[PDB]
Symmetry: D2
Subunit: 342 residues, 4 copies
């Protein structure tokens, strides 16, 4: 890898997880964002989306709590109503433009409907396309599922996820883009927080091994794993402390120090849950990597809520955004005392 | 895998390598065919290709020496000058329509220009599109290289190859399409035939393992490997006896009997050489699988040559096709005495 | 591997599974044989064992149904009461002396009591020791267990078994000894004959892959797998035909033609069950390898029974031996009609 | 793994690499020590070794620079001339008793004389035997070699190494014994330091992966790798700065933070060089793990030299020990200024 691009990779990767800042994931596809909009009964118009992405990226002050924003293709190339290109709104607040570059989840034949992530085809060309658009980091999401009964996640699922992410990451780096390796394991099921730690540890082990095999520069890469948590169905009352501990443990057991940081994913956690947990993790003293956030839902839920599509509520909702952005910023320093919303 | 599709895959896989028949590869992309045409100084027009494909698939009597013909997308959906759909010319002569599903070779980042075969994005839908259009089996080509000095093929190559193929092969089988797993090792370089056997043995072992890992029904699939030959620069005069022995050996050492047959590839072998070799192979007593051919160049060279585009030479050319196509048919039984051309 | 030793390996491996002959496993350790003896209330004296091994190996005519006898260390070096060395009794009846060379099963730390096989330490020296004693083939037994609920056999179990056998086999060959690779999967449990086929296929896949990695000459090796059968607890009434089919399928799906033969293991099957099943397997037409037996209990049960330790019953029991030896010999040709005992 | 043993392993692992202390390797086998003694023309008698070990473990004040000392079986159970048990000399100076558990290197069949470390047979029982005798941690040494031309280290080596270590490491941990995973890559050959980094990175990656696969509690174990240096024939004058950088890099790229520390090995480095290098390493700011030493030769050379066996030189020699032992202690803090000998 050219010493220049390499140096670039390392720089942005490190800038992406600088002290007190996380990444806002506003990369919802036209489909998923529809889901988000439906909750506030908003019409999934191109105008509505543009107004939304403009609401987030235009929030004056967002640059202190956000290091980078993961953008969806559309948004990466669009402008708001007043002709201001979205990436410029980011630049205004010193936020780094990012771009989701995977073409979605499909099933693996001969597995009980376990996902595979499309995107490798043409990815290299797209990367350049995006860099020119002003993007500096990319994201590719995979989905693993725990089901002790049905033996999930199977080795094929794990191997597939390992190799895919690896291939993808090796490509982005070639094209001056820092890869956010996202091997998400879904909390779905009655599995306990212990199983989650075990499965999460196994997966990450495989992941990094694949990264090694393909030659992914860890120093110019980021990991976006699921925090260790109980299954959605597990009645056993686990505490935020367990979450933090078990998570930090499994990470220390797998993630080499070369990796600049870990940008956590809220998954199905509530906005507060994510803030607290993230906090309880950093609360656990000095870690060898940054343990920040890459929150989307956990950062947008109330925003999208209080907005209701009605521009009359734009400012009001922009505050809500900073409210959550600051919570998670302090949570970075283990300084978030539950209060910025519930 | 549904008992119905399984049975079908098994059926066509076995039909595709029936006694005495091989596969005709006429799936040349617009670019590659251009190269072929350039030799006879023919213009790479749509009409010219149409006439050429038509010339091949029209050859009355072709069905006795040809089980199936690998078509390129275009040819799979086109007709000849007289409005006759190309697939129909095949049906006429009882030939099975095949389709090349790989979207091309690309480089693996962090390897000395080693390839990665594009395709998996969409492949499922495309497979359906093709099945409807009368495609029964598919093709995917991977390119490995031997370079002892530079340590090629690297594990990354061999790995990417294995997983790529297996990924494709499973998708195809899901969509009633028999997959021809093509792990081609370029005979380029001064490597000896002994090294070719070793490397090939390795490569195959890794491939079949990935096939297993992904759930590729061997009984409903086929393999198109290179024959065990010396390198293009190996001054060591090796015999066709050697080619036959080593090849049969490395195959017995790696291919499970559940695999219907091996459709050999000519590569850079002269039409006669490919025939001779394929004969030397089959000559080695009964084998657990069919050791047939899936030639393209070693079948078309003389035809395209004698044709010169001039329709005035159509039948003259077609004769040459049957000349070769029969040569190899006998080679199948080990009954080919070097004579059908040189 | 020296062409001479290699040639030797191939020869004995092929001689070991010649037409109509199987291998008698009389390699019970002082512990296990105690178990066998207890059933007839025999004292586990050295004299008793010697009388026993002498009863088997002395049976005039045993050389037609037995190609080789797997011996336990002791027996390999002992003589009978009249000073006749055991290996000489074998030579008399043209039976090839074999030797169990693994030091037993221990557990794998961090697995639910899954076995690991000791023996690698010093194995090479022992091999020579044994060859000098007149042994030509060796055996090393591993034990895998199916438990869908507890996810057994785990990958660690499978990987361990794969690598161990591999290491062992590569050593024996070096020392002029043909290795009988035995990856036994126990029928214990409520798993169905379908699961057994699936698990057995997975395991064999891994096994042969490891063999490849270590460089085990398949042509000078033998496999001793468990037949595909229902779990001991599975109430679902399976037929001998299913057993035969499913077994042959999984074998064709994994075992390369290079492997000279497969010497089946009776495990917990009754003497007849083993004869019938073995028969129903060969009944399934021409196979690419020998599918013979390596029966021990299935060959000794009635012998040890009718003998009762009382020499007055030696001849009577010797007949019983041939009775079973012939059953399984015909079963080799798919010619065993249930009758030689029940 | 029991919470009690887990805690213990974790404890001693962390104690074994406490600030400023390293490990003294005096586990030399009767044969290797003979070599050492031959240099000072001393007779390899039982008494001589006893006096030598006694000289080392008696050094009043040694405990400040030495956390633990790797003993050979003999020394672990012997006493000095005055009847004082060797382990007691250690306890006196608060040094932790360690034991080498590997039964020696052997060749891997079908590799150009690459090693395989014996031991696993019995290791469990022996571990108990040793724990009782006061052994708290253990040692196992694997030897890999770099030979770009002959493609060394082969995957078979790297694999066997990884699985061997992990197998041992898990057994030790079961029996309250902290395992020192020793993947030594011989600096032999003209390979550059860049290649050493690459190969080392690879090797470590594979090792930690096997450790994971086997369930080796990283927190209760330690690693003894080679430092990243150039080959014995590499005329390219590399600096200690380079050694320090590359080494720190390849480690950050492969070692999870859960691993307490890295106990470096001198190999063929001169006492001073090992000190300098180890200093250049620690000099590179704070690290997530302890980058201490586990020297043997680089600690004993001058001592054994100045001793000449003549007890008349005992104290004179002991001073030299503390001379070096302190050198490295400061090297630990990056405070060693080249002066304690040359």
């Amino acid at each position: 890898l050219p010493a220049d691009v390499a140096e670039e990779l390392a720089t942005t990767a490190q800038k992406l997880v600088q002290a007190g800042k996380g990444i806002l994931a506003a990369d919802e596809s036209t489909q998923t964002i529809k889901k988000r909009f439906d909750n506030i009964k908003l019409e999934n118009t191109i105008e509505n989306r543009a107004s939304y992405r403009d609401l987030l990226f235009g929030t004056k002050g967002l640059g202190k709590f956000i290091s980078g924003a993961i953008l969806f293709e559309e948004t990466l190339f669009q402008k708001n109503e007043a002709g201001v290109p979205m990436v410029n709104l980011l630049h205004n607040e010193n936020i780094i433009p990012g771009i989701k570059v995977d073409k979605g989840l499909v099933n693996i034949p001969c597995t009980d409907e376990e996902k595979s992530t499309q995107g490798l085809d043409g990815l290299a060309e797209r990367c350049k396309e995006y860099y020119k658009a002003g993007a500096r980091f990319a994201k590719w999401r995979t989905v693993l599922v725990i089901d002790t009964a049905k033996g999930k996640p199977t080795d094929l699922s794990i191997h597939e996820t390992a190799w895919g992410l690896a291939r993808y990451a090796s490509i982005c780096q070639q094209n001056r883009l820092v890869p956010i390796v996202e091997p998400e394991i879904l909390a779905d099921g009655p599995h306990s927080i212990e199983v989650c730690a075990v499965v999460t540890q196994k997966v990450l082990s495989c992941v990094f091994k694949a990264l090694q095999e393909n030659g992914v520069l860890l120093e110019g890469a980021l990991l976006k794993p699921n925090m260790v948590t109980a299954g959605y169905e597990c009645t056993a009352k686990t505490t935020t402390q367990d979450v933090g501990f078990l998570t930090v443990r499994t990470l220390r057991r797998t993630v080499p120090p070369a990796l600049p940081g870990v940008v956590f994913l809220s998954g199905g956690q509530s906005e507060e849950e994510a803030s607290v947990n993230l906090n309880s993790i950093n609360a656990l003293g000095p870690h060898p990597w940054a343990l920040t956030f890459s929150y989307g839902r956990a950062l947008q839920a109330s925003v999208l809520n209080t907005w209701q599509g009605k521009k009359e509520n734009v400012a009001k909702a922009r505050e809500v955004l900073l409210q959550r952005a600051e919570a998670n910023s302090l949570a970075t320093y283990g300084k978030y005392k539950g209060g910025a919303g519930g």
